[PDB]
Amino acid sequence: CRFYQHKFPEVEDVVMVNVRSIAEMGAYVSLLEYNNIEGMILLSELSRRRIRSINKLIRIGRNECVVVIRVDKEKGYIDLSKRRVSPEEAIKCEDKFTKSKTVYSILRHVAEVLEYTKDEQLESLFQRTAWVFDDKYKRPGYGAYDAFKHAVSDPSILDSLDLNEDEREVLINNINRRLTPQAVKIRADIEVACYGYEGIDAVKEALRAGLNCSTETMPIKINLIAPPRYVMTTTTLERTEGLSVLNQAMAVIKEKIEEKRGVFNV
Amino acid sequence: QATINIGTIGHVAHGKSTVVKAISGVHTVRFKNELERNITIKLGYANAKIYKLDDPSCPRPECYRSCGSSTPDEFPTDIPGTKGNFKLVRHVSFVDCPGHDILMATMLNGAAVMDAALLLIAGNESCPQPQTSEHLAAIEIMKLKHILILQNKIDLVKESQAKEQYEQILAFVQGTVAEGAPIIPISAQLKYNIEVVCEYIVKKIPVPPRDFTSEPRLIVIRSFDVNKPGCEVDDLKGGVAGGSILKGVLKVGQEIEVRPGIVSKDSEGKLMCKPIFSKIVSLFAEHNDLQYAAPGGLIGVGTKIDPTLCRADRMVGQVLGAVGALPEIFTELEISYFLLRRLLGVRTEGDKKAAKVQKLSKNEVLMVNIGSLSTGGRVSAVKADLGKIVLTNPVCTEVGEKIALSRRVEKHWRLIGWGQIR
RNA sequence: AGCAGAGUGGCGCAGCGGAAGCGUGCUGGGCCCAUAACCCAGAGGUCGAUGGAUCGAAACCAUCCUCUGCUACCA
């Protein structure tokens, strides 16, 4: 069924297709960036340079990024072109192609149980759920994946509008399985060069105080990579909440060790 | 623990691992392993237990027989006795010094804390070989004469060649003690006559008088690889010094001071140095726990110093005294000295070169090996029997003892003379 | 041992959320009187193990092992 918010493409929009035949006059191709509607590419507007081979360019069974040059709205002729394509558009379109595939796979679990004897089943599910998720956040550059990703980490998004059954478990499982494990790249940077012998116990007091105002029972990940370097991967959230945990903790270890003898790295 | 330190010094290409494993049973090993471009060029460590079945031969644990594995060309077998437990005679310690000429300053340092030696001669090269003489002379200067020459590589060397070599060495060294030192030819490819070596080292080398009552002094020569394992970091519960003690029974929990010191921040001169103080965590020797560390033995003293001082070999030739030791920490020093009339440690097949070296000139950098310390320093005043030297890093002078003085002849320093501090 | 890569389906390099990806080679065909250049065509097959989501996993994501690259120590 449709993979996109609108059924028909517009004018000058970047899309994706999959080649199913090669024509004399260009390439007649099916879309997989929308419905399986037909769109015709023309030979002239594929490149601005010569062309020796022809199967080392376009061939069957390839996703190809393209621009919709014209569309007949009533007839359903989607004129197409590969002449204006930049690699930056390919990154943006590959993401939207891949994200729609995963979102429609989530909106396939819904159809496994419900009445789907007719092809239009998924279309019924798509219009009513998809649009209110993505339309509210299309202007900021988000897909319906953002709405679902927000629901798993704070559940009020999918309870603000009609909640389905049995969907919720598989929805949670698939969001939490695929978009984790989930991750902190927090590493402490600490340098010490002691003349102390009481440094061994001094470091222990400093290590356990990586995060202030936490319980004595807080689990953390200590790492020793080299003798002066003390890496502490602090409490694992998303690395946008443990910023204060990373920054101010570094001051503790370097200060605690200077009080017991000599100068150290700051 | 240990009772005596026998050193295993010997010039290039005689094989160290075969002989060292036969005497101690503990491999000589160090950084870069790897193995060894030839023979060990690091300061190796090893201890061993010497027992008897009431026989001059020394057993293995399996004391019924011993079948070697030195070569599969033939089977070398020896018989120490038969089994029913063996009586412990003593615990011995070794000091494997560098076998290569460039490493002379290190060989000197390591040597200077031994109580006896084993000159490992190799029959492959020249008969009055440079390094044999170099070693021997240094040994008689430091205060030893408990030497057992060992002909360590005469496996394929014919009996005329090997006979001529022992003769020429013993005839060149006509002014250095060597006539009361035995010369034991051995095999190192079939480990033969090893049993008779065991008889020699208990005969020629008893325990010399050790002063327990006198104040502890530990001379550290080797650092420690502590720490960085797990679990619980960082840096360590600290740092281990491989040192021998030459005076005093160092007891566990005692505080010890490393006396060459660390120099004060923003010094405009050559003074001031401040000793570092560390409490003794543990007194480990062999593989057996101890509460004491008797003198005359090479012991691993774990102390409460932190990883940076032991992360590399940086504690070579440091003097440690318990605690607030009286020994002066000179930065500029008054050497009395004398020179050899030959250049020691160099002499090849053809007169080229080895003769009389010219007199020292002021503002030249020379290695003064004082104690086990190795510092570099420049000569500020040069009279024949009174030179004044200024040293880069301060030297703790335990006693006025001896010194060894070397001059940069070419690529590296070479031994020119000795003397005594005033 | 910290970090990185890989654990062939001809070779060599190993590409990404669709079951050989890229470059190359070998073999055959085409063009040409002929060769080169140029154009086409190939090939038994969980891609180290133990698991989860999945329609499916070298490849989507984990838990383990091994080999190496850089850094580097316990031994």
Side-chain angles (χ1 to χ4, degrees), chain B residues 30-60:
Chain B
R30 255 256 133 133
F31 57 89
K32 248 216 301 144
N33 57 266
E34 268 271 275
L35 255 204
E36 191 48 69
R37 225 41 192 227
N38 186 243
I39 58 169
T40 54
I41 196 164
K42 294 83 58 169
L43 192 64
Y45 47 97
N47 285 194
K49 296 187 174 61
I50 172 166
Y51 19 78
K52 63 187 176 66
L53 285 164
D54 302 1
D55 195 66
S57 187
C58 183
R60 305 191 304 180

Side-chain angles (χ1 to χ4, degrees), chain B residues 51-164:
Chain B
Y51 19 78
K52 63 187 176 66
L53 285 164
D54 302 1
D55 195 66
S57 187
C58 183
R60 305 191 304 180
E62 204 299 296
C63 57
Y64 183 68
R65 215 123 298 176
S66 50
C67 191
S69 53
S70 49
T71 193
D73 294 326
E74 253 287 271
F75 295 99
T77 303
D78 291 301
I79 306 181
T82 188
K83 54 186 177 181
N85 304 298
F86 31 70
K87 302 183 181 62
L88 185 64
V89 178
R90 62 186 187 200
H91 301 294
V92 57
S93 182
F94 295 91
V95 182
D96 188 289
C97 297
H100 292 274
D101 64 293
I102 302 178
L103 280 291
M104 56 89 59
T106 306
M107 177 278 297
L108 291 170
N109 300 152
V113 293
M114 76 202 171
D115 295 77
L118 285 159
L119 182 62
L120 283 57
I121 307 187
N124 303 315
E125 58 183 295
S126 197
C127 296
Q129 208 278 324
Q131 264 60 62
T132 58
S133 304
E134 187 173 59
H135 301 321
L136 291 167
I139 295 169
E140 187 181 71
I141 265 63
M142 58 182 68
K143 64 193 179 181
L144 296 170
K145 58 179 181 180
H146 301 146
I147 309 175
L148 282 164
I149 304 179
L150 192 67
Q151 209 172 31
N152 206 78
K153 181 56 61 177
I154 42 169
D155 304 306
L156 199 60
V157 183
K158 59 180 66 179
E159 70 295 298
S160 53
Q161 187 171 358
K163 178 196 66 57
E164 189 61 62

Side-chain angles (χ1 to χ4, degrees), chain B residues 141-281:
Chain B
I141 265 63
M142 58 182 68
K143 64 193 179 181
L144 296 170
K145 58 179 181 180
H146 301 146
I147 309 175
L148 282 164
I149 304 179
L150 192 67
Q151 209 172 31
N152 206 78
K153 181 56 61 177
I154 42 169
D155 304 306
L156 199 60
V157 183
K158 59 180 66 179
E159 70 295 298
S160 53
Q161 187 171 358
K163 178 196 66 57
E164 189 61 62
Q165 184 173 71
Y166 97 85
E167 185 178 0
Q168 292 192 46
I169 61 100
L170 191 57
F172 190 64
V173 306
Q174 60 178 255
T176 301
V177 60
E179 73 299 302
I183 309 179
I184 308 87
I186 59 164
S187 191
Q189 190 176 347
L190 293 168
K191 53 76 170 180
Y192 195 57
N193 298 352
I194 59 93
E195 52 185 297
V196 200
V197 181
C198 305
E199 190 183 299
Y200 284 116
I201 59 176
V202 179
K203 189 181 297 182
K204 178 57 179 170
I205 311 170
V207 185
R210 249 65 188 83
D211 301 297
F212 283 72
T213 189
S214 301
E215 196 170 296
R217 283 86 178 84
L218 171 68
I219 296 178
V220 180
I221 42 175
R222 303 184 202 83
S223 255
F224 202 134
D225 260 60
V226 176
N227 245 350
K228 205 264 313 294
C231 174
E232 231 110 78
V233 105
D234 41 59
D235 262 309
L236 284 299
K237 180 177 182 179
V240 178
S244 189
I245 300 179
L246 73 175
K247 186 183 296 182
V249 53
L250 190 62
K251 56 184 177 295
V252 68
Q254 182 54 46
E255 288 70 58
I256 200 167
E257 174 186 52
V258 50
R259 254 282 166 174
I262 185 170
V263 184
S264 301
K265 193 177 183 65
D266 199 60
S267 187
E268 70 296 298
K270 57 180 76 64
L271 285 170
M272 183 175 70
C273 51
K274 296 188 295 180
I276 297 171
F277 295 93
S278 52
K279 184 185 180 70
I280 295 172
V281 184

